[PDB]
């Protein structure tokens, strides 16, 4: 594989799994639980879902990632994070992701 297992490394990012609800290009709006939003839920204004999942919902910020085109809303995905602003809802600054799928898991 080019993808070494990462498992070993010197620079132990914090990875936390969860769904893009909302996307913008700078940030990211994500569910940290397992509960995915219902329809309505991804047909509400964001401010109405941050204040719904408030107990669970975190902001990423993209703005280190110049390539959140890969990156897709009404998915799952698994974050790399270290630096975070815990205001309620708290936001976490990720200069790197990995995408998942529904379909399958162990993404290629």
């Known amino acids: 594989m080019n993808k070494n297992e990462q498992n070993g490394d010197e620079t132990?990012?914090?990875?936390?799994?969860?769904?893009?609800?909302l996307k913008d290009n700078e940030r990211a709006i994500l569910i940290t639980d397992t509960k995915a939003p219902g329809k309505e839920d991804?047909?509400?204004?964001?401010g109405?879902?941050?204040?719904?999942?408030?107990?669970n919902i975190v902001i990423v910020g993209l703005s280190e990632?110049?390539?959140t085109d890969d990156l897709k809303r009404g998915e799952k995905i698994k974050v790399w994070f270290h630096t975070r602003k815990e205001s309620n809802p708290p936001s976490a600054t990720?200069?790197?992701?990995?995408?998942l799928l529904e379909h399958h898991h162990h993404h290629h």
Not at 42 to 46: D, G, P, R, V
């Open 12 to 21: 132990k990012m914090q990875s936390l799994v969860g769904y893009v609800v």
């Open 42 to 46: 991804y047909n509400l204004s964001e």
């Open 48 to 55: 109405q879902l941050m204040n719904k999942f408030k107990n």
């Open 65 to 67: 990632i110049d390539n």
């Open 94 to 99: 990720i200069q790197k992701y990995e995408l």
